[PDB]
Amino acid sequence: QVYRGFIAVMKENFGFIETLSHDEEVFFHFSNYMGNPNWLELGQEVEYTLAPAENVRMLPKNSIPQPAVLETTHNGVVARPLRCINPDQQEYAGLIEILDELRTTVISQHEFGITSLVNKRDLLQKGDLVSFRIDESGRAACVNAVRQKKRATVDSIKGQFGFLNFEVEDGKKLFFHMSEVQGNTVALHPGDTVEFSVVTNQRNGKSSACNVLKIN
Amino acid sequence: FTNVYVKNFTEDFDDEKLKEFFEPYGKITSYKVMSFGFVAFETTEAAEAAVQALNGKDMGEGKSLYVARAQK
């Protein structure tokens, strides 16, 4: 009846709760949430009653005990992504693998969920090189993707999203949303230089992540 | 600051045996077994020295120690 978990997906009028074991997802409607939906974080600890969830209650931080995260930073490659970005697969949790130098022998595997990612909105597909730490359960923690940084100039702006002078698919300009800009800056103009990373959906097209304005 | 990963050891392998096995090669700042195991060295030369001296050590019971660095 009564469970506990973390917020994994937040959409328009609905969302999903990652279970306590990080191995399943529970759907819940915003009408059954006790509080403001806009004030709800990703990875937020919640307590919910099952019907399909109902009566979702937000919890204070560290209310759900979790394994301690070790200090050493490791490097790995993604094998399975989360089902939140890939509903095709059967397994829910993602998989990170530490490989040998020849990239052919598996040293160890480490599962990850929504609470394992530094950027909860980050798009981690198979083949991405990541930097992460390990918790006491063996799961991946502090997961961050290693991507080569690019830098171009802002070309245009249309509302809450614009384009850079970076050519990707069939000579197109790189898309970027204002939700990826750093600092507290409201001033972003065509001609400004930004340093960014290039993320790409393996089912469709490309985007850009974490772009900070470089103007000195 | 290069990590070394241990794999396929005996059942009496503890956190201390892992430290005793790898400390005569360099300064260790972090290590853990976790059911597989790893060691964090300060200098990268202490890591390359430990891999060449412990991969295939023979821990007994037909167990050969797999010691290797990670992909990059």
Swiss-Prot record, chain A:
Reported effect, E25A: Decreased affinity to RNA
Domain CSD: 2-58, 73-146, 149-214
Localization annotation: Cytoplasm
Highest taxon of source: Eukaryota
Phenotypic consequence of Q202A: Decreased affinity to RNA
Protein family membership: Belongs to the UNR family.
UniProt comment concerning the protein's domains: Composed of 5 canonical CSD domains that mediate RNA-binding as well as 4 degenerate CSD domains (non-canonical) that do not bind RNA. Interactions between canonical and non-canonical CSD domains mediate RNA tertiary structure specificity by reducing the conformational heterogeneity. The CSD domain 1 mediates association with the 3'-UTR of msl-2 transcripts. CSD domains 7-9 at the C-terminus bind to poly(A) sequences of RNAS.
Function field: RNA-binding protein that acts as a regulator of dosage compensation in both males and females. In males, acts as positive regulator of dosage compensation by promoting assembly of the MSL complex, a multiprotein complex that mediates X-chromosome dosage compensation. Promotes MSL complex assembly via association with roX1 and roX2 non-coding RNA components of the MSL complex, facilitating the interaction between non-coding RNAs and mle.
Subunit structure: Interacts with Sxl; cooperates with Sxl to prevent translation of msl-2 transcripts. Interacts with mle; promoting association between mle and roX2 non-coding RNA. Interacts (via CSD domain 7-9) with pAbp; promoting translation inhibition of msl-2 transcripts.
Protein name stated in the entry: RNA-binding protein Unr
Organism of derivation: Drosophila melanogaster
Gene name in the database record: Unr
Parent-record interval covered: 762 to 989 of 1039
Curated annotation (Swiss-Prot), chain B:
Subunit and interaction comment: Core component of the neuromuscular Atx2 complex, composed of at least Atx2, tyf, pAbp, Lsm12a. Interacts with Atx2 (via PAM2 motif). Atx2 and pAbp form a subcomplex that can associate with the 5' cap of pre-mRNAs independently of tyf, Lsm12a or me31B. Forms a ribonucleoprotein complex (RNP) containing at least me31B, eIF4E1, cup, tral and pAbp; this interaction is required for the translational silencing of maternal mRNAs during the maternal-to-zygotic transition.
Similarity comment: Belongs to the polyadenylate-binding protein type-1 family.
Domain (RRM) ranges: 1-70
UniProt name for this protein: Polyadenylate-binding protein
Disruption phenotype: RNAi-mediated knockdown results in increased incidence of spermatogonial tumors in testis.
Residues of the full protein shown: 182 to 261 of 634
Taxonomic lineage of the native organism: Eukaryota, Metazoa, Ecdysozoa, Arthropoda, Hexapoda
Top-level lineage group: Eukaryota
Known role: Binds the poly(A) tail of mRNA. Since it interacts with the cap-associating translation initiation factor eIF4G, it is likely that it functions by linking Atx2 to the cap-binding complex. Forms a complex with tyf and Atx2 which functions in adult circadian pacemaker neurons to sustain circadian rhythms likely by switching between activator and repressor modes of post-transcriptional regulation via interaction with Lsm12a or me31B, respectively.
